[PDB]
Design a protein around this ligand. Structure first.
Ligand SMILES: C/C(=C\CC/C(C)=C/CSP(=O)(O)OP(=O)(O)O)CC/C=C(\C)CCCN(C)C
Length: 678
């Protein structure tokens, strides 16, 4: 909580409060199509788009992404801008430098092995070349590398279902500028509600040139105004931006700083949610599975009511697809489907099918070394997918997922792929990463203090002689700290860790028979020599914890502590650790939620947790089924009771993670607790 830290938090809040239709970089290709429009008197309709072009040429004469050089991106943006400038006979200094760049680099188009192909390049690029030849621009139309691209365009055009494109909304509307022989009377019926052709400024500019439709013009006027002459390759991106910012702040481990602002963002997303899902932009007649899956997951996680029926439209013969009627299955979309499918409730068959499909799809891509995505160049997509394949959501503890994501997140260096390369500065942001590194390291420093205190407690109480090994001590501390990690929740974190250790000692030391258990239970109330000693350890520890909470927060929970341990002991002697830990955590909270221990919803959750937290595949699957019921109950909870339901889910996930991964935790424990980020 340095001043600098607080100011950084305030800067992220200012971002969140001020989101509108998307902070997205300008596409020179799209700006050039806007700049081509004739106002009606043989002058540009948008002189500020022509100015943008001339002002934003790169020093080598190209246009495009300055920080990620791609021949495809540079050559299509540069050709478009030269066509725009030459068409009006304006800015010849820039126009000629662009022609020089094109002449010198066109032969290099295919030089980069792993270069990602801009969307629609193979139709859009030859189309621009034919415009350029029409206005007599002297570039090498006969460059040898250009034989195979032109062949591809005619092939693509014969495959497009052009009659369907005129009847129902499809993704083809985003790219009309490379097509010929269109029927505008039909296509105008498919205009989006903001005047665009599927949120593409270039496609909309071409439509306007062919139809002079006023609603196309208003979409363009609005975009050119917002971006001071330029336009992006897709706009708006309001839903994409709202959803991805929430996802990134959550995964980076810093979302608790932004609770109010995140609620407002998700209220916005929910306002535009529909029974058919969503795309990147509100109020669309085309939806996509990546936006739909991300919004579904975040809305369900935050307690909004959403139906898994939204996914039905994307399913075909047991497989799932990014868009209806297209074969694309992007790694990132299927990753986001896999994440969403894990929030399925027991009755949601379509998500069970989606979970199987997307898990197996990603497993195969990983095996074949095809974890590469058409929509984005990321720092570490294989790392993200690898973690998701290895650690299901039911086993994913907050600090474990965050510790790995902070090393995967690309910050400002990720680049998205549209018709041209683009950036999303409020999704992919180095300041978020710096805040996340600082916060992670600050919490980790506190955990290291506590780990020293905990080892001193273990040694002073001689717990090694009551059957608790050093390796177990570290596991108990880790599961608690990786779950309840905040510096201000030390009391909850430490009561869970110490309680779990004492249950192990008591069980190891007195759990063998009914006599041994009675012996211990009697000594607890009475406080056989041995049982009295371990009993005093337990009692001393409860007293210290309640005293510390009283001195720090004024809350007296002593009687509550003893009641809960008493209840656990009764059942143990006869024959429920999950429920004991949940009560302990709730007791140490800086408020009073213990009034809920009697509530029907508490009792229901307690019944389920005691079935998860058992005293192997079959056992894991049994736990998952019970987990599924807990999730549905917890996620459907009243706001005041939310903290309690969250606690049940916390404890259960720690148990599930241990059951699944507990044979080989060493690298996770080291990264989470003992290796600083950065
Ligand atoms: C309508 C769009 C693409 C064109 C249609 C498609 C899909 C063609 C791939 S089919 P193909 O395999 O044949 O390859 P090409 O022919 O198109 O080059 C998407 C525009 C939106 C964005 C850029 C925002 C994405 C935000 N999302 C990441 C969250």
């Amino acid at each position: 909580n340095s001043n600098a830290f607080k100011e950084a938090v305030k800067s992220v809040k200012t971002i969140l409060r001020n989101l509108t239709d998307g902070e997205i970089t300008i596409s020179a290709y799209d700006t050039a199509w806007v700049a081509l429009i004739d106002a009606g008197d043989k002058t540009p309709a948008f002189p500020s788009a022509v100015k943008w072009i001339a002002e934003n040429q790169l020093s080598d004469g190209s246009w495009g992404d300055a920080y990620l050089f791609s021949y495809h991106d540079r050559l299509i943006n540069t050709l478009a801008c030269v066509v725009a400038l030459r068409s009006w006979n304006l800015f010849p200094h820039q126009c000629n430098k662009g022609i020089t760049f094109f002449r010198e680099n066109i032969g290099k188009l295919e030089d980069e092995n792993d270069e990602h192909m801009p969307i629609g390049f193979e139709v859009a690029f030859p189309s621009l070349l034919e415009i350029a030849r029409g206005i007599n621009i002297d570039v090498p139309y006969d460059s040898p590398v250009l034989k195979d691209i032109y062949a591809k365009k005619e092939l693509k055009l014969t495959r497009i279902p052009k009659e369907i494109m005129h009847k129902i909304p499809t993704t083809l509307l985003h790219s009309l500028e490379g097509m010929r022989d269109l029927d505008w009377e039909k296509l105008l019926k498919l205009q989006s509600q903001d005047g665009s052709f599927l949120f593409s400024p270039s496609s909309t500019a071409f439509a306007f040139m062919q139809t002079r439709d006023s609603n196309c013009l208003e979409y363009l006027r609005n975009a050119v105004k917002r971006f001071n002459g330029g336009v992006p390759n897709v706009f708006p991106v309001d839903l994409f931006e709202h959803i991805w910012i929430v996802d990134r702040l959550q995964r980076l481990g810093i979302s608790r700083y932004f609770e109010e602002e995140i609620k407002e963002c998700l209220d916005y997303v929910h306002r535009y949610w529909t029974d058919n899902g969503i795309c990147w932009a509100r109020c669309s007649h085309v939806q996509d599975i990546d936006d739909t899956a991300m919004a579904f997951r975040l809305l369900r996680q935050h307690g909004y009511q959403v139906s898994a029926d939204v996914f039905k439209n994307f399913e075909k013969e047991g497989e799932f697809f990014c868009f209806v009627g297209q074969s694309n299955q992007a790694v990132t979309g299927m990753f986001n489907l896999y994440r969403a499918s894990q929030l399925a409730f027991p009755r949601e068959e379509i998500l069970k099918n989606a979970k199987e499909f997307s898990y197996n799809y990603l497993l195969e891509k990983r095996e074949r070394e095809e974890l590469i995505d058409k929509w984005i160049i990321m720092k570490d997509l294989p790392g993200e997918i690898g973690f998701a394949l290895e650690i299901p959501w039911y086993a994913s503890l907050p600090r474990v997922e965050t510790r790995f994501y902070i090393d995967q997140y690309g910050g400002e260096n990720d680049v998205w792929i549209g018709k041209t390369l683009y950036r999303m500065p409020y999704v992919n942001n180095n300041g978020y990463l710096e805040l996340a590194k600082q916060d992670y390291n600050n919490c980790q420093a506190q955990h290291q203090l506590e780990w020293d205190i905990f080892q001193k407690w273990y040694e002073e109480n001689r717990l090694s002689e009551w059957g608790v090994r050093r390796s177990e001590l570290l596991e108990c501390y880790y599961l608690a700290a990786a779950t309840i990690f905040e510096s201000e929740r030390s009391h909850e974190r430490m009561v869970w860790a110490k309680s779990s250790v004492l249950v192990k000692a008591i069980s190891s030391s007195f759990g063998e028979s009914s006599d041994s258990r009675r012996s211990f239970s009697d000594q607890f109330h009475e406080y056989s020599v041995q049982a009295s000693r371990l009993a005093g350890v337990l009692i001393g520890t409860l007293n210290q914890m309640s005293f510390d909470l009283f001195m720090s927060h004024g809350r007296d929970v002593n009687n509550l502590l003893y009641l809960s341990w008493g209840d656990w002991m009764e059942k143990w002697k006869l024959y429920g650790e999950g429920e004991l830990m949940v009560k302990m955590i709730i007791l140490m909270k800086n408020n009073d939620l213990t009034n809920f221990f009697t509530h029907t919803h508490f009792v229901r959750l307690a019944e389920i947790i005691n079935r998860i937290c058992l005293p192997k595949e079959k056992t894991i699957k049994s736990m998952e089924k019970e987990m599924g019921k807990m999730v549905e109950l917890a996620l459907s909870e009243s706001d005041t009771f939310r903290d309690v339901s969250i606690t049940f889910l916390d404890v259960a996930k720690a148990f599930y993670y241990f059951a699944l991964c507990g044979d080989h935790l060493q690298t996770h424990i080291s990264k989470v607790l003992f290796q600083k980020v950065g």
